[PDB]
Design a protein around this ligand. Structure first.
Ligand SMILES: *[C@@H]1O[C@H](CO)[C@@H](O[C@@H]2O[C@H](CO)[C@@H](O)[C@H](O)[C@H]2NC(C)=O)[C@H](O)[C@H]1NC(C)=O
Ligand SMILES: *[C@@H]1O[C@H](CO)[C@@H](O)[C@H](O)[C@H]1NC(C)=O
Ligand SMILES: *[C@@H]1O[C@H](CO)[C@@H](O)[C@H](O)[C@H]1NC(C)=O
Ligand SMILES: *[C@@H]1O[C@H](CO)[C@@H](O)[C@H](O)[C@H]1NC(C)=O
Lengths: 99, 106
């Protein structure tokens, strides 16, 4: 009983084509990128993936930003807790504000 | 930005209604598994690599650079001391060679 705007567009000749890559395929790309980043660092972006512990990867990052790696190797638990809290805050901001 | 790999050079070549770049890049080729450690205990001190990683071939411990397997004996010149052994998670036990001791003995 209620005509739809999409129905009117379809009847008047305006068609929406589906994208080539499905949302499952996009999620597969993002999952592959996440797994490669976590398990190899940047090495998977310049050839083959080289496995490396994540603490060593974060030590690489700390040396990259100009901070000695002993800072990470002595504040690993605090840094992990801060990262987890920031992720939880991202979740809470997404689950409350929609703008 | 300029070719997949670690950028070294680029060469411009003209073309009709455009330009062509010949990007030169470095790509690692042959991998190898190693057992690695973040720091090393020596006389109660924690040694960290200045530039490289602490790898092992099963028996001995060496320090290399990250992008090429060039093993070097762990000394006090390629490592630096920070703190003690009770903080770092995953620290191992190995000896660190001091170049001054043979000269003092001789
Ligand atoms: C790990 O590497 C070390 C350093 O090369 C090896 O130690 C030497 O091994 C050669 C033969 O491979 C011997 O001739 C030398 O006498 C060894 N030197 C010392 C100081 O031990 C070691 O054998 C290697 N281990 C493995 C399992 O490959
Ligand atoms: C390293 O170990 C993994 C464990 O399965 C193996 O698949 C791989 O072939 C080994 N060598 C390299 C270079 O990764
Ligand atoms: C390494 O990973 C294993 C597997 O979960 C875990 O039990 C262990 O605590 C981790 N750390 C070390 C130093 O083995
Ligand atoms: C290293 O040696 C100390 C004593 O010298 C010992 O308490 C410690 O357990 C050793 N580390 C490992 C990984 O066996």
């Amino acid at each position: 009983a209620a005509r739809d705007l999409i129905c009117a567009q379809k009847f008047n000749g305006l068609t929406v084509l589906p994208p080539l890559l499905t949302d499952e395929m996009i999620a597969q790309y993002t999952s592959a990128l996440l797994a490669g980043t976590i398990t190899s660092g940047w090495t998977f972006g310049a050839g083959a993936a080289l496995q490396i512990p994540f603490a060593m990867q974060m030590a690489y990052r700390f040396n990259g930003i100009g901070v000695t790696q002993n800072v990470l190797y002595e504040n690993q638990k605090l840094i992990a807790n801060q990262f987890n809290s920031a992720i939880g805050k991202i979740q809470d901001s997404l689950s409350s504000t929609a703008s | 930005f300029c070719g997949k790999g670690y950028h070294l050079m680029s060469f411009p070549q003209s073309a009709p209604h455009g330009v062509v770049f010949l990007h030169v890049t470095y790509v690692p080729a042959q991998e190898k598994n190693f057992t690695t450690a973040p720091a090393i205990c020596h006389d109660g001190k924690a040694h960290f690599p200045r530039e490289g990683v602490f790898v092992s071939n099963g028996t001995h411990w060496f320090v290399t650079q990250r992008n090429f397997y060039e093993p070097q004996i762990i000394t006090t010149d390629n490592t630096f001391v920070s703190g003690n052994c009770d903080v770092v998670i995953g620290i191992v036990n190995n000896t660190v060679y001091d170049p001054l001791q043979p000269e003092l003995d001789s």
